[PDB]
Structure formats: structure tokens, C-alpha cells
């Protein structure tokens, strides 16, 4: 019995205001 | 019995708010 | 019996604010 | 004059190789 | 005069080289 | 003038070679 | 009885975030 | 009876964040 | 009875974050 | 000027001679 | 001037020579 | 002037003669 689990979260934002 | 489960969210947002 | 369990969070957050 | 480039690039890759056998007698 | 460049890029990568047997007798 | 250059590369790799064996008489 | 399990898996990935400016007065 | 299980798994990858830039006056 | 079971995995990773500037007066 | 050469070469041969 | 140049050979052989 | 090169040669070779 091979249980193998994986969860990867993963994010990213960029963001530029000129005024 | 090889269970293998896997969840990869992922998320990206760029934003240019120029005035 | 190999249960293996795996979570890699991430994140990445860049900004260039002009003024 | 104002200018601004934000620019990015996500890649993602899996492998799974496995296998399995299984007797009676 | 004024500008900016941010720039990224992630990556991931994943291998998973398993097996198994079993027998009963 | 003024300028900037925010840069940044993230990376991951992953293996797992694993295997198994089970016999009863 | 005689078995065998010949198995592999290859895998690339490439990412190229470039960029360029110029100005001439 | 005689078994046999090759196995294998390769994986690469790639990553250029560059730029540049150029003034003349 | 006889078993083998040859096993392997390789792996490569490569990241090049660079940048560049020039001016002339 | 950003010259980038690259020359990545891979190989890989299984063999299973059953007699 | 970003003059980027790539060459990725590659190959596979696998065999099962039953007799 | 960036003159960025790379050659990154692999090979690998398994092998089970059974008789």
C-alpha cells in the first residue's frame, strides 16, 4: 500500500500604480 | 495498492493602475 | 505501507509603486 | 515621461513512474 | 523620466519513481 | 531620471524512488 | 515463468522572461 | 520463476529571467 | 525464485537571472 | 548584447534480454 | 541586442529481445 | 555584453539479461 498525497498551493501578484 | 491523491491550486494577478 | 504526505505552500508578491 | 514592465512566468511538471504486480497460490 | 521592470518567473518540478509486489501463499 | 529593476526566480525539484515488497506463507 | 518491466519517463521544461529598452537622443 | 523491473525517470528544466537596457545622447 | 528490480531517477534545475545598462554622452 | 547559447544532449536505453 | 540560440537533442531506445 | 553559454550532455543506460 503505496498512499501518496500532495498538495502544492501556489500564488503570485504584481503590481505597477504609477500616478 | 498505490492511492495516489493530488491538489495543485495556483493563482497569478498582476494589476496596472496608472492615474 | 509508504504513505507519504507532501505540502509546498508558496507565494510571491512584487510591487513597483511610482509616484 | 513614466513607464512600467511587470512581467512574469509560472511552469509546473510531474512524473509518475509506478507500478505494481501481485500473486495468489 | 521614470520607469520600473519587475519582473519573475517561478518553476516546479516532480518525480515520483515508485513500485510494489506482493505474494500469498 | 530615475529608474529601477526588481527581479526574482523562484525554483523547486522533487524525486522520490521508493519501492516495496511483501510475502506471507 | 519469466517477466520483465522495462519503463522510464523523460521530461524538459524551459522559461525564458526577457525584456529590452533603448533611447537614442 | 525470475523477475526483472527496470525503471527509470529523468526531468530537467530551464529558467532565464534577463533584460537590459540602452541610452545614447 | 529470483528478483531484481534496477531503480533510477536523475534530475537537473537551472535559473539565470541577469540584467543589463549602458549609457553614452 | 546578451548572447545565450545552449546545447542540452540527453540519451537513455533500456533493455530486457530474456533467453 | 538578446540573441538566444538552443539546441535540445535528445532520444530513447528501449528493447526486448525474448528468445 | 552578456555571452552566456551551456551544454549539458546526459545519457543513461539500464540493462537486465536474464537467462
Same sequence: chains 1, 2, 3, 10, 11, 12.
Avoid: H, R, Y
Avoid at 1 to 17: E, G, H, P, R
Wanted: net charge negative; hydrophobic share 70%.
Amino acid at each position: 500500500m503505496l498512499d501518496i498525497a500532495l498538495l502544492m498551493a501556489n500564488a503570485s501578484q504584481l503590481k505597477a500604480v504609477v500616478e
